[PDB]
Amino acid sequence: WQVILEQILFILGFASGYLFLGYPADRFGRRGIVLLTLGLVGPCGVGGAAAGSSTGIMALRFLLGFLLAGVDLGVYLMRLELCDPTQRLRVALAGELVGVGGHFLFLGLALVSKDWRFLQRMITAPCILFLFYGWPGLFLESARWLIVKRQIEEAQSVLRNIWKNLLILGFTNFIAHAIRHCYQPVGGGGSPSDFYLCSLLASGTAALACVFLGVTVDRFGRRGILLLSMTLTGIASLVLLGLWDYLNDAAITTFSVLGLFSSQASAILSTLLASEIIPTTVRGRGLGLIMALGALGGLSCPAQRLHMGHGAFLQHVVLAACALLCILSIMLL
Amino acid sequence: WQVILEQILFILGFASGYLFLGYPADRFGRRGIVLLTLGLVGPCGVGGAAAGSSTGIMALRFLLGFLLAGVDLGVYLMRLELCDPTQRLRVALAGELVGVGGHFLFLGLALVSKDWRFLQRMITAPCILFLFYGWPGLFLESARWLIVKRQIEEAQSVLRNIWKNLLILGFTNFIAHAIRHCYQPVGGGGSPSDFYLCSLLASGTAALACVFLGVTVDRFGRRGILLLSMTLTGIASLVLLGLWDYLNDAAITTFSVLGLFSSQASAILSTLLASEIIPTTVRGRGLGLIMALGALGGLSCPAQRLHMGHGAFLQHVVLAACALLCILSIMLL
Ligand SMILES: [Fe+2]
Numbered sequence: 327w328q329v330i331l332e333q334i335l336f337i338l339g340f341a342s343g344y345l346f347l348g349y350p351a352d353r354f355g356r357r358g359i360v361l362l363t364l365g366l367v368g369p370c371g372v373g374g375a376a377a378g379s380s381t382g383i384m385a386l387r388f389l390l391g392f393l394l395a396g397v398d399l400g401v402y403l404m405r406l407e408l409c410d411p412t413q414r415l416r417v418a419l420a421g422e423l424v425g426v427g428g429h430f431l432f433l434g435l436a437l438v439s440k441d442w443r444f445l446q447r448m449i450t451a452p453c454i455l456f457l458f459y460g461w462p463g464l465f466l467e468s469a470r471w472l473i474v475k476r477q478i479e480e481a482q483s484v485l486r487n488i489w490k491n492l493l494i495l496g497f498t499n500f501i502a503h504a505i506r507h508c509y510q511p512v513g514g515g516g517s518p519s520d521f522y523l524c525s526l527l528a529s530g531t532a533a534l535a536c537v538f539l540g541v542t543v544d545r546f547g548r549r550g551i552l553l554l555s556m557t558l559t560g561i562a563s564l565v566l567l568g569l570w571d572y573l574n575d576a577a578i579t580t581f582s583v584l585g586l587f588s589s590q591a592s593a594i595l596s597t598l599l600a601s602e603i604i605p606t607t608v609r610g611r612g613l614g615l616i617m618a619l620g621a622l623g624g625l626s627c628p629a630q631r632l633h634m635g636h637g638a639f640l641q642h643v644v645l646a647a648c649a650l651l652c653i654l655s656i657m658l659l
Numbered sequence: 660w661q662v663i664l665e666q667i668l669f670i671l672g673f674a675s676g677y678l679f680l681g682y683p684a685d686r687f688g689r690r691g692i693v694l695l696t697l698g699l700v701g702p703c704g705v706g707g708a709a710a711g712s713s714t715g716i717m718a719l720r721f722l723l724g725f726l727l728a729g730v731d732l733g734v735y736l737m738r739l740e741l742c743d744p745t746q747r748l749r750v751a752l753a754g755e756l757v758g759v760g761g762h763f764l765f766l767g768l769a770l771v772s773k774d775w776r777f778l779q780r781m782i783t784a785p786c787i788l789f790l791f792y793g794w795p796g797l798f799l800e801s802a803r804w805l806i807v808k809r810q811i812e813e814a815q816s817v818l819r820n821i822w823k824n825l826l827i828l829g830f831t832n833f834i835a836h837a838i839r840h841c842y843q844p845v846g847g848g849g850s851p852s853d854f855y856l857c858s859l860l861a862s863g864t865a866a867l868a869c870v871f872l873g874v875t876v877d878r879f880g881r882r883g884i885l886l887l888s889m890t891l892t893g894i895a896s897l898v899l900l901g902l903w904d905y906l907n908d909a910a911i912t913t914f915s916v917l918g919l920f921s922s923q924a925s926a927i928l929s930t931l932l933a934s935e936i937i938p939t940t941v942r943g944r945g946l947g948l949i950m951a952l953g954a955l956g957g958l959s960c961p962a963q964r965l966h967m968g969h970g971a972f973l974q975h976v977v978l979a980a981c982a983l984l985c986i987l988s989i990m991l992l
């Protein structure tokens with residue numbers, strides 16, 4: 327499918343950006359890279375939406391994904407640096423649903439506009455990745471951090487071991503991404519007709535996935551919830567597959583929507599935990615790599631869940647059994 | 660003030676672009692101008708947020724307003740051409756949610772992130788202009804039309820008197836813009852602590868302002884409601900000024916929130932009405948002009964409303980009395 331090829335190229339662009347723009351991030355700086363990546367995302371995204379040739383379309387889509395990866399990593403670094411450690415957690419949580427907000431707003435626009443005309447060409451349902459349609463302005467709306475840095479610099483001028491936690495968090499971040507798309511018993515999107523019902527659900531499920539992850543991790547600790555946010559999907563994925571002995575089609579939805587809680591809470595939280603282990607220096611080398619594994623792990627739905635479709639439980643059990651490995655290694659932190 | 664000088668420049672950037680970028684929209688086509696303007700919005704908006712020197716801060720804010728002028732006007736021409744005329748009313752209405760979506764999300768992330776720090780070093784409060792912070796999203800999110808145009812154009816390859824209504828609508832669009840900001844007993848919210856309560860109100864009031872303008876103007880006609888959406892602000896602005904004999908501070912809010920209905924429904928509906936009068940040719944010179952006066956009419960908040968504030972009833976009554984000229988000229992259509 328053309329859309330799935332776009333999504334796979336976009337995920338590969340995210341992987342390449344997250345894996346190759348860390349060294350510039352910690353060498354050149356954490357501010358200039360954001361400006362360069364955003365000022366290239368703009369024209370690159372416009373051209374990708376403009377120049378339609380089916381051969382350069384994927385090239386500019388990959389380039390846009392690479393630049394979006396760079397700007398996302400830079401924005402993450404600036405958020406974790408400028409903000410005070412007392413409330414940095416809330417900023418990071420709000421900085422992880424920014425793409426969720428962009429995608430939900432795009433879908434709401436399409437609904438109120440009633441213009442479902444970019445659909446009806448897609449043979450299969452599109453991948454739900456947020457940043458595919460949550461890039462347009464969500465990151466340029468997150469340019470508020472550039473303003474904050476500008477005012478901080480102006481005020482300043484006026485006044486004038488590690489690898490062990492990287493692999494455990496890398497696998498946890500990778501699994502928490504590649505298992506989110508597996509919580510979809512209705513095909514791999516249930517045709518584009520049901521795409522909005524799943525985009526609203528996934529975005530809406532991410533909203534509550536930041537509530538019990540937003541108000542409890544401070545009291546319970548980031549490691550304690552990460553174990554719970556990885557064992558909740560360790561029960562939400564067996565009864566979904568193994569013990570689904572007449573789940574009456576209603577316990578199939580209370581568990582999948584519960585799976586998207588833990589899967590999207592063990593991916594948001596795992597990104598935060600990588601910051602503490604890595605020092606201020608070379609922070610982007612490893613912290614970007616953790617989501618680089620995660621961004622590369624967004625290949626569940628596009629690469630295999632939609633392409634094969636039939637017998638997709640074999641991927642679900644492999645990833646669900648891999649969650650046991652992540653659970654047994656989370657306590658090792 | 661430092662912030663309000665951007666708003667005057669942005670509006671003058673919006674007014675200059677709306678008036679000047681009408682010749683290209685009818686000579687160079689309605690699609691290329693969108694790609695050129697939106698392509699340049701990215702780098703321009705980032706550069707304005709990057710190079711902070713108080714002289715380029717407004718220099719690339721004027722240019723950003725000029726570029727966003729073509730984007731809003733260029734999308735509008737494609738909105739009413741690509742979409743079917745049967746449901747063009749909903750698309751154009753939902754297309755006017757460009758300001759609300761981008762602005763509301765900007766103060767959506769800030770509420771969750773609790774990062775109200777860019778408003779600390781700022782005196783009084785910024786003007787409530789949605790596209791000031793709603794520019795990032797809802798325009799590159801409104802690239803769906805470029806996607807839609809690509810599919811339609813690709814499908815084709817597969818198969819291979821007037822001035823009287825301009826002044827009445829121009830004045831109506833201008834008045835309906837410059838009177839909305841006058842529905843504020845506190846100037847711009849006064850202290851910045853009330854800015855979100857006014858941004859949520861104005862955006863929320865614009866939400867219902869598209870409901871009774873969305874479900875009734877089809878049955879009642881665009882001209883009939885425009886008279887009612889201009890005679891409603893002829894009472895919400897008259898009893899707020901003339902008969903405010905102990906409105907007990909609660910009937911004041913039931914009228915301001917009712918004034919923001921009519922003033923933001925006689926500004927959205929007026930833009931739609933001018934589309935039909937002007938033919939398909941020279942549909943950018945005049946249709947842009949109606950909101951070129953309207954965008955130039957967005958100076959009311961940067962005007963006496965916020966600059967001096969004291970005795971600003973004189974500016975409100977002048978516009979309210981001018982609204983009498985607006986309603987009396989509506990039947991002349
Ligand atoms: Fe991300």
Ligand SMILES: [Fe+2]
Nearest residue numbers: 731758790950
């Ligand atoms: Fe506009």
